[PDB]
Design a protein around this ligand. Sequence first.
Ligand SMILES: NC(=O)C1=CN([C@@H]2O[C@H](COP(=O)(O)OP(=O)(O)OC[C@H]3O[C@@H](n4cnc5c(N)ncnc54)[C@H](OP(=O)(O)O)[C@@H]3O)[C@@H](O)[C@H]2O)C=CC1
Ligand SMILES: NC(=O)C1=CN([C@@H]2O[C@H](COP(=O)(O)OP(=O)(O)OC[C@H]3O[C@@H](n4cnc5c(N)ncnc54)[C@H](OP(=O)(O)O)[C@@H]3O)[C@@H](O)[C@H]2O)C=CC1
Ligand SMILES: C#CCN(Cc1ccc2[nH]c(N)nc(=O)c2c1)c1ccc(C(=O)N[C@@H](CCC(=O)O)C(=O)O)cc1
Ligand SMILES: C#CCN(Cc1ccc2[nH]c(N)nc(=O)c2c1)c1ccc(C(=O)N[C@H](CCC(=O)O)C(=O)O)cc1
Ligand SMILES: Nc1nc(=O)c2c([nH]1)NCC(CNc1ccc(C(=O)N[C@@H](CCC(=O)O)C(=O)O)cc1)=N2
Ligand SMILES: Nc1nc(=O)c2c([nH]1)NCC(CNc1ccc(C(=O)N[C@@H](CCC(=O)O)C(=O)O)cc1)=N2
Ligand SMILES: O=c1ccn([C@H]2C[C@H](O)[C@@H](COP(=O)(O)O)O2)c(=O)[nH]1
Ligand SMILES: O=c1ccn([C@H]2C[C@H](O)[C@@H](COP(=O)(O)O)O2)c(=O)[nH]1
Lengths: 508, 507
Amino acid sequence: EKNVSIVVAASVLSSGIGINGQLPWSISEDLKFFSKITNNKCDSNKKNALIMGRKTWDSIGRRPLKNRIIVVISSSLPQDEADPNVVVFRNLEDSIENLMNDDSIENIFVCGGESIYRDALKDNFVDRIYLTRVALEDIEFDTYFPEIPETFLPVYMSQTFCTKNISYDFMIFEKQEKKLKSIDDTVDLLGEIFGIRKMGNRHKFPKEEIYNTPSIRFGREHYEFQYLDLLSRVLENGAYRENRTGISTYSIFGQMMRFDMRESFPLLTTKKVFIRSIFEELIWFIKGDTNGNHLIEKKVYIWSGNGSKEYLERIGLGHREENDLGPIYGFQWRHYNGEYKTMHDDYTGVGVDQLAKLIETLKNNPKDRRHILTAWNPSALSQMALPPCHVLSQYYVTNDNCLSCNLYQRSCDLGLGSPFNIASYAILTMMLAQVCGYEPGELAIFIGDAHIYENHLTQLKEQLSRTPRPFPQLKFKRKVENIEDFKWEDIELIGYYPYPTIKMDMAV
Amino acid sequence: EKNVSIVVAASVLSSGIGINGQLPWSISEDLKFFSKITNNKCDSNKKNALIMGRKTWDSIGRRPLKNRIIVVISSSLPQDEADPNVVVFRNLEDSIENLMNDDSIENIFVCGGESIYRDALKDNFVDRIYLTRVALEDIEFDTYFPEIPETFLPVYMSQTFCTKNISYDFMIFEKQEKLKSIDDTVDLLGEIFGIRKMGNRHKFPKEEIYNTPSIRFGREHYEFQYLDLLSRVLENGAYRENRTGISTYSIFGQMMRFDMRESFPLLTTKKVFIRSIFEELIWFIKGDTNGNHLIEKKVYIWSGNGSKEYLERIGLGHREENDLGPIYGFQWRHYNGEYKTMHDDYTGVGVDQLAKLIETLKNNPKDRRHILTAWNPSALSQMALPPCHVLSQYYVTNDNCLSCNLYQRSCDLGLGSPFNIASYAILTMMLAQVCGYEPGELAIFIGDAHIYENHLTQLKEQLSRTPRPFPQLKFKRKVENIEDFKWEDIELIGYYPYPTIKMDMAV
Ligand SMILES: NC(=O)C1=CN([C@@H]2O[C@H](COP(=O)(O)OP(=O)(O)OC[C@H]3O[C@@H](n4cnc5c(N)ncnc54)[C@H](OP(=O)(O)O)[C@@H]3O)[C@@H](O)[C@H]2O)C=CC1
Ligand SMILES: NC(=O)C1=CN([C@@H]2O[C@H](COP(=O)(O)OP(=O)(O)OC[C@H]3O[C@@H](n4cnc5c(N)ncnc54)[C@H](OP(=O)(O)O)[C@@H]3O)[C@@H](O)[C@H]2O)C=CC1
Ligand SMILES: C#CCN(Cc1ccc2[nH]c(N)nc(=O)c2c1)c1ccc(C(=O)N[C@@H](CCC(=O)O)C(=O)O)cc1
Ligand SMILES: C#CCN(Cc1ccc2[nH]c(N)nc(=O)c2c1)c1ccc(C(=O)N[C@H](CCC(=O)O)C(=O)O)cc1
Ligand SMILES: Nc1nc(=O)c2c([nH]1)NCC(CNc1ccc(C(=O)N[C@@H](CCC(=O)O)C(=O)O)cc1)=N2
Ligand SMILES: Nc1nc(=O)c2c([nH]1)NCC(CNc1ccc(C(=O)N[C@@H](CCC(=O)O)C(=O)O)cc1)=N2
Ligand SMILES: O=c1ccn([C@H]2C[C@H](O)[C@@H](COP(=O)(O)O)O2)c(=O)[nH]1
Ligand SMILES: O=c1ccn([C@H]2C[C@H](O)[C@@H](COP(=O)(O)O)O2)c(=O)[nH]1
């Protein structure tokens, strides 16, 4: 018995695989992939067979593929042995029987053509599916990959990769089929005896009804799962608790998330994330601005709630003007320890400029272990509309000249805050990198109180039902000399195809 | 063919399993284990059989064990027919013969006796060994569990558990003999992208540097949290120079978890000197920055960075020897206080975070703002050394335990890390006592996790020893103020470490 699996690359949304007899894109790595997986075998004396429609044969240029034996499906072509490494069959049904014969053939691959895919599937001929998702969407297709039958389940999803600014993705699907205990049993019993006295019971693995893409058990490589799985983890273990807002949450303490920034930009796809607001709040921080009006003026309202007259009055800052947030994130970054008056005052030269120092240090002493930025000032906490949630960040230059960032975040609203925080510190690191002459590295976020407000429960359940797509790419149109110079127009987001936005009320 | 497992509870160091015909300790949970493990079966119509020597039959009361069939090995006991759930045999070989029928009998267990354990092993009878390590030594034993054969390799090690202040854990040993689908794809994809695929930047450690390699899916003992971060840098650590003369191997952004409910995370694979740790902690707590006061008590961990040759080198030779400046203690009690010298009276100067902390944990426990920090941009220049364990957060569970999170920007795995873990396990226990809570969990998030090149051979020495159960740490009395804690107030129970490992600090 031998294996027969499909290999294909289609657009992420509509699954387009071709146009005018050609691929709709040019990605080396993907072909290098097709080659690697297609030649993969363990019997030297044997070879793999690659079935393909005639038109695809025309696209390949009718030349053989090294170490393999192409197999064309055509109504009209000769069965001669001009080339031993190429055979032809009148139909796909018959094309199978490489099993029946050819102990010289180890594995079979359907390299397709739409018609051929749609039949290999229709007749239950295929076992596995190697699918390369390409974030190239808005563009003419004449050939598409058939909708995957529900008898298949994804078991692997790779991280996102980049080529010519195009994001993409390797997935594997498999068909469903019928029907050492010692450790699991011992641990279970030990769990019955000790209850929550055994830490493991305090960190129970998420039940599948709340596990994203459950079928992917050992292949959760997409680093978007770092966020989706945290969501699951708290949905499963989160203790119910009251808080200052009056809207209770489910909270666990001390989690982590890593994201790569070398090959892509971590902007969540399982829901539409509004990146106009993340960047805008970012330079707003970078410039050391604490006037919430400047934000509202650019139609960004994320700080209105904690800026209103009532709330300010409620927390004892009734003297402030309608949106004077006090010495929050911006102020601490540019003027740590500055004596704060109002948002109208000029703070030029007052306080310690950490961002400026960070940059001068990253350039001059890169391997220095003190690249730190903090917003936690005990002396100023009472003047802040809100004490800083993402509390301090550390920056780290690799030997191969990338800039990575670590951020501890005391309080994290998984539904509303986190997506923003991820995109933000990714952008900040990139900006920092360009300005210091580096490439983006990795992003790691350490969370203290990781929670999900109880009025976000059905919305997050919704998001958890959507399988993640490839992360988009983010590029700067120009190299600026001063970090405080970036503008929205300077930003280019390439290949972002999120699921629909999901409304979620913030708790003031 | 049927499974044969041993079940035993022996002391961690000398393998003592008995004294004067009875167990040398009383641990309820362990018996519950024995009961659950030996009762565990698939077929309801079948039963398991427990083999034991006559003396064990004696100590067991000579009454049957519910739901199971006892098999007594005795040369003398009368082979009657009376109790259906108990049988006697004249030798081990013959009892096997459980294996050949009683298909009623699903699984087999050797519940031992020094003589029976020794024989089940000597004759290649056992497939598995369930071993409860009890952290009790320095007490008489007249019976022992034999030495584990080399044909056996550990596959599981539970976290440390606590009963009547006694530390203990659970292990499993297997015997040796002679879907790549996803893994193949990842390999190939790795070939194609190299360092571009994040996974290649985080390679799994080679087993030559992995502690106790046999335990693949069962490294539950959270000594592994540290030991594994160690081998993880050993595998990916980028060689790089540093302020000091000694280069380092490092990776960025790591984390470790530790349970503090059933045990105290004091590393066992190497003797850790907790006393210096304690003395440094109250020193911090007091808000003291005087390196002398530390040297006073024979604690020199800070002399290195307190020497005039060092203070001179960093442009601080302007002050007395060992006047470290506004460092940990000063920022904790007197954050943003204007530092002068280690002698002035700072009463009232600066924000008292430690005080606020205790007041908040008590008055508002669910509050998401229990933070303690040491990173003060304005003071960094006056410090003999900038803070390394930089800021922590504290957390009150609904079940009244206190958890702590720590972020170290810089972390010397061989020397500092072991100290930081213990230090904060203590600080959290203190806070919890003072605030009326129980110890919770400890998580350490690291920035620059590194290993100084002059520690390589020592750390590989450490990675060669299999971890032992964590000990327990108890306070002898309840204190009024958190700064009333004294060394004698601390009680370290059940700490049996491997020999200490000498490592030099990079000044
Ligand atoms: N992105 C990706 O992963 C891939 C994309 N592609 C793209 O797909 C396109 C080709 O798709 P498609 O148009 O389907 O062409 P195909 O490669 O599927 O070729 C179809 C041809 O195969 C023969 N054939 C098909 N069905 C039968 C049958 N039932 N019995 C006998 N012969 C049969 C016929 O040729 P005849 O008339 O000679 O009998 C038919 O014209 C190209 O644009 C190519 O670039 C191709 C492979 C992979
Ligand atoms: N920690 C733990 O998990 C356990 C500890 N223990 C401890 O171990 C001690 C008992 O061990 P031990 O002293 O070895 O006594 P055992 O329980 O091993 O029994 C020894 C007796 O078994 C019979 N016997 C043993 N070997 C043979 C043989 N080869 N042929 C015929 N008969 C044999 C003999 O009985 P006879 O004289 O009738 O022929 C012998 O006197 C107790 O102190 C108990 O507390 C026991 C079980 C578990
Ligand atoms: C972190 C952070 C920054 N912040 C600051 C901020 C301030 C107070 C907070 N308070 C609470 N309880 N949770 C938060 O996430 C939070 C976040 C945010 C504030 C609001 C939204 C928000 O409601 N976002 C909507 C976007 C609406 C839109 O952009 O049009 C969303 O659907 O995501 C996001 C981030
Ligand atoms: C973290 C921290 C606290 N500190 C403070 C401290 C200060 C500067 C440092 N510098 C460097 N490079 N590494 C450190 O771990 C370090 C630690 C420590 C200092 C010394 C030892 C140490 O040498 N411990 C013993 C040796 C001394 C003894 O015998 O007691 C050991 O061999 O383990 C441990 C912790
Ligand atoms: N995943 C996937 N991607 C594809 O582009 C693809 C596919 N599958 N299946 C069939 C197909 C049809 N088109 C093509 C085009 C070129 C080659 C090809 O050049 N194969 C050589 C490439 C050598 C290389 O790039 O290293 C091979 O050696 O496999 C194969 C199929 N293309
Ligand atoms: N791991 C281990 N610990 C032991 O103490 C132990 C062992 N294994 N193997 C054999 C043995 C011999 N002594 C004893 C003493 C009492 C019981 C006993 O009464 N067992 C009951 C306990 C029920 C309970 O405590 O919940 C049983 O139901 O099995 C068994 C063996 N003792
Ligand atoms: O950058 C931010 C701003 C704050 N929040 C969330 C954390 C909490 O849900 C709330 C802050 O409330 P406190 O933890 O301070 O009570 O807003 C974030 O997640 N990230
Ligand atoms: O609590 C501590 C005290 C400092 N060190 C180590 C970290 C480095 O090995 C060295 C300080 O190096 P810098 O990052 O400050 O250059 O001391 C620790 O690991 N933990």
